[PDB]
Design a protein around this ligand. Structure first.
Ligand SMILES: [Ca+2]
Ligand SMILES: [Ca+2]
Ligand SMILES: [Zn+2]
Length: 369
């Protein structure tokens, strides 16, 4: 399918937002990512855009007027005047109020949508927005560190020019927000691979398959602790292949949540950057308008490496394992390499389990026209 034109969305301000003392979600990781790919000379091969700030008008194409209205108003100075509404909208602990909250959502969202609009116009083959991928956010509620669901809004944009859009979610956590939004339609197929069993967000069972017009247009691959490169690659390509064959989308959205990497602070998977990036490689080969977003990721050196590498994969541009000098060079010790080693954790996902789940999803997929 040849080399592909990549467009890439980043706001220099994004790293300055702070969830608070001790919070694992660190918007700084995107700036590190940015700096890393810059120092590898990857700006030479792609177009760089600074997203606009998405507006409430844009946000309410999915979200309720009341919830956005709230997000626009809530500040740390005025919290105690909003306790009820906070509780209503699950803003308080997991999803803290911080300085610039709304603007952060605006910039996060603005890349996802600008990416979609760019793809809609047939001006890029791939769009990259690492600040996006906030799959947990719900119509009137924040969840799992996400406030505004940029993915959904982006898909609402793609649906303007595409009958069928494929959403794939390789974050360790289940894409409930996206799944939920599109649960009753066939215009969006959602595919989430994720840890399942006593683990946020609690949804994403094999048996969760959509409803109504959208029965079989939601697909879930529940996994256990310690999944590795061979196990993941054993099933990702076969499943993505069958899905492409049966569903035939004309646009793909790929959430590349990096918390599925080995050594993640909150994750319990054992993938490498290469294993992780293999997913991007597989979806790439299909040659469809492809929007790539971020998501989870809490060992921030590993997040930087992951998305740097995956941007380079978008570009089909080989980069050395020797990290170039960069503004965060010390975060990458003691090795200063691009690629990571798996840990020695047990893979609870037997080869047999992986084959069984895949055979069951195959059954489900036979049910499409
Ligand atoms: Ca997932
Ligand atoms: Ca669906
Ligand atoms: Zn996650």
């Amino acid at each position: 399918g040849g080399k592909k034109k990549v467009c890439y969305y980043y706001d220099g301000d994004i790293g300055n937002y702070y969830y608070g003392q001790g919070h694992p979600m660190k918007p700084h990781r995107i700036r590190m990512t940015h700096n890393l790919l810059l120092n590898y000379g990857l700006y030479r091969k792609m177009e760089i855009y600074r997203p606009h700030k998405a507006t409430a008008e844009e946000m309410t194409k999915y979200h309720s007027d009341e919830y956005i209205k709230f997000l626009r108003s809530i500040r740390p100075d005025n919290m105690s005047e909003y306790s009820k509404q906070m509780q209503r909208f699950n803003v308080g602990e997991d999803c803290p109020v911080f300085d610039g909250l709304f603007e952060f959502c605006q910039l996060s969202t603005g890349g996802s949508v600008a990416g979609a609009v760019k793809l809609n116009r047939q001006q890029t083959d791939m769009a990259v927005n690492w600040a996006g991928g906030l799959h947990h956010a719900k119509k009137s509620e924040a969840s799992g560190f996400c406030y505004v669901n940029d993915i959904v809004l982006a898909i609402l944009e793609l649906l303007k020019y595409h009958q069928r859009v494929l959403y794939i979610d390789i974050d360790i956590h289940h894409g409930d927000g996206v799944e939920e939004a599109f649960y009753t339609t066939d215009r969006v197929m959602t595919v989430s691979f994720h840890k399942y069993g006593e683990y946020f967000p609690g949804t994403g069972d094999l048996r969760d398959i959509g409803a109504g017009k959208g029965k079989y247009y939601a697909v879930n691959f529940p996994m256990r602790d310690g999944i590795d490169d061979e196990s993941y690659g054993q099933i990702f390509k076969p499943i993505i292949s069958k899905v492409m064959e049966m569903y035939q989308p004309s646009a793909v959205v790929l959430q590349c949540g990096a918390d599925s990497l080995s050594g993640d602070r909150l994750g319990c998977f054992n993938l490498t950057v290469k294993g992780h990036a293999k997913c991007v490689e597989v979806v790439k080969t299909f040659n469809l308008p492809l929007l790539m977003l971020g998501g989870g990721g809490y060992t921030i050196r590993n997040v930087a490496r992951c998305w740097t590498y995956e941007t380079a994969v978008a570009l089909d541009c080989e980069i050395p394992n020797e990290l170039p000098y960069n503004d965060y060079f010390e975060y990458f010790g003691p090795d200063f390499k691009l690629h990571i080693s798996p840990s020695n954790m047990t893979n609870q996902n037997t080869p047999e389990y992986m084959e069984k789940i895949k055979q069951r999803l195959f059954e489900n997929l036979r049910m499409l026209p």
